[PDB]
UniProtKB/Swiss-Prot annotation:
It comes from Homo sapiens (Human). The chain holds residues 18 to 129 of 205 of the full protein. GO terms for biological process: CD4-positive, alpha-beta T cell differentiation; defense response; humoral immune response; negative regulation of interleukin-4 production; positive regulation of CD4-positive, alpha-beta T cell differentiation; positive regulation of interleukin-10 production; positive regulation of interleukin-2 production; signal transduction. This is CD83 antigen. It comes from the Eukaryota. Residues 3-66 form the Ig-like V-type domain.
Amino acid sequence: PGTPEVKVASSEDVDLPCTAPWDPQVPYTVSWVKLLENERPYSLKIRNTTSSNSGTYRCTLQDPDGQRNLSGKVILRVTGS
């Protein structure tokens, strides 16, 4: 609900977008997780996608001062064959 979705055919590559509402002119570092229980900045590259890559992912951007971070979620659905 409210979470954007990326659909990709199996065996294709995908750059999963970071959906955190980040600040321009801030040099973030990015860390990605999968929640179990290309000219766009901060995307997660997933090569040769398979059915098991489907799920919900979370991107976290860390401000260089180490005092703030921002997170956003995105769903991946792998299809085709």
